[PDB]
Amino acid sequence: DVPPTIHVPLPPTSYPAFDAAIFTDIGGRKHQEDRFTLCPQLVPGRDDCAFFGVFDGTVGDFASENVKDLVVPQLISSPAWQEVTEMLRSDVPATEVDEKLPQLLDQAVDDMYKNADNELVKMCEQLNKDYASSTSVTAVLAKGFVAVGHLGDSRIAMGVETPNGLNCEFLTVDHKPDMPHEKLRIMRNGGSVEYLHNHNNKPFIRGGDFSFRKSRGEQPMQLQYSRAFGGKDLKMYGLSNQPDVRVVRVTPQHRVMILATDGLWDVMSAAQAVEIAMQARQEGRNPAQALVEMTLAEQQSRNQSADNITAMTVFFK
Template identity: 30%
Template sequence: MGNCISCISSDIQVYGDDFHENCLHIVERGHKVGSVHSRRGARGLNQDAAILHEGYGNTEDGVLCALFDGHGIYGHKVSMFVRNQLPALLLNQRSSLGWDEACVVSSFEAMDEQLKQFEHVDSTHSGSTAVVVIKQGADLVIANLGDSRAVLGTITEFGVQATQLTVDLKPDIIAEANRIRDSKGRVFSLENEAHITRIWQPEEDIPGLAMSRAFGDFNMKSYGLIAIPEVFHHRLNSEDHFLVLASDGVWDVLSNEEVVSAVWSAENREAAAAAVTYRAHAAWSQTFPSARPDDCTAICLFL
């Protein structure tokens, strides 16, 4: 997919609007610390966006990994706008002690408000999920909004082990469904896709979102959809080897263990993210032969 771009810049916008046609390698002092790769599906424009930024927070060991999966007619614009704006909002909300849950939640709420006021993107019926990881030394702050996912690869005596760090926030989670129904939204599956639970407006069969939290989608914000992330913390140890963030196009067809295995068996760190997206793309034709593959994007950060 296009050309790979090498970068040692500490600029927060690591790559430009050609992301959808390119993969990216990040270099730190001559060593590859991670890779990003996106493979467009068969549903139109690639609506995924991502950032992998070293030196985040003006610290040598600071890293920001973030992945945004857009949906709706302007989903590609929403995901790109959030990718370009959220890192700065997170920095502005950071306290003297770093990022606690209140700081992260405030940043996400401010991001949603900015998106609502942004005249050049109509996000009434379009939105984006987000999974964000901030690494400061051995500490990870993880924020999740929607159904993208973060997974940790840990070395054990039996090989590499996958640990899921986030919860997929979908309408089939009881607490999520209850919140939506309490706000008069509806939660149900269509007859021809009983395995997918969606959310709908009270009187109309729209929009049919398969996630329960997202930026944008302001037509559903009165009916239980929220832009408040779940925030987790994780303390790294010496056995934690790499981190994978991926959009639901990957997780729909690959297990945590399969994704971790793809990274572990990749030729090198630079090829790790591409190994995940190519394996996911191949799995779509096997798992859902009559379906159009979704966009598949992965970030791999080696720890």
């Protein structure tokens, strides 16, 4: 019932509508909490649909390890997705498809996020995982459209060729606790946004019970992003599972999409990543591995302990 998915490093592999590569590295962390999911053929009988997902876990790998196996099943169980499947298998005029498909994809991704999180949170309740959380950047490719969704601070970069050169941008903006409306939601729900000494630029979302649990000699946790999967004991204090969704038309000029964790972005800009990835391909090298190894080399050069780093490169055709 669920199409085959990939969750291990993937060297350069050619598919009908795109070529993909996936590489990850633990870096200098004591744990590997990054996870990912790639479904090459999302819709049986078709060869132009695929799912892409990368997950940056924190406070253990529980949330990222599990959510990765919940997204595809939840996605296709969506009544919204059933309508996507029915329309792709119908006579319905093309012009009409391309006109309705975007909102159907938007709604399906929305359903996926909320349903996958409800299921994950119930698991966290079962196994007593109070703060296990994970960011998410996902991409659903379907008949020339890519439905981008995300929660947290992992990002998706896009390389598009123009007559004046390669246009490189992020399709997602991080969910940070200090963004005015995020902060507003956290305080309305009894949580707070903490700006700690010497770290004014990276505030934390803190639960309303943090202080009490801290005095009880326990270990309440905080996050530096305001939306995510998991975070059981923060979901009632402002941590949202509402993803920002964006549907983009894959045009002839679209060259590459890069899904990666902050382990890559805290070091490289969108343009730098695309360039490195574009060059690697051009020279027959593993684009995703190039992104990770290049990042690790730079970190050493800076005397910086590297974070977990995961990169998934997708080249359109």
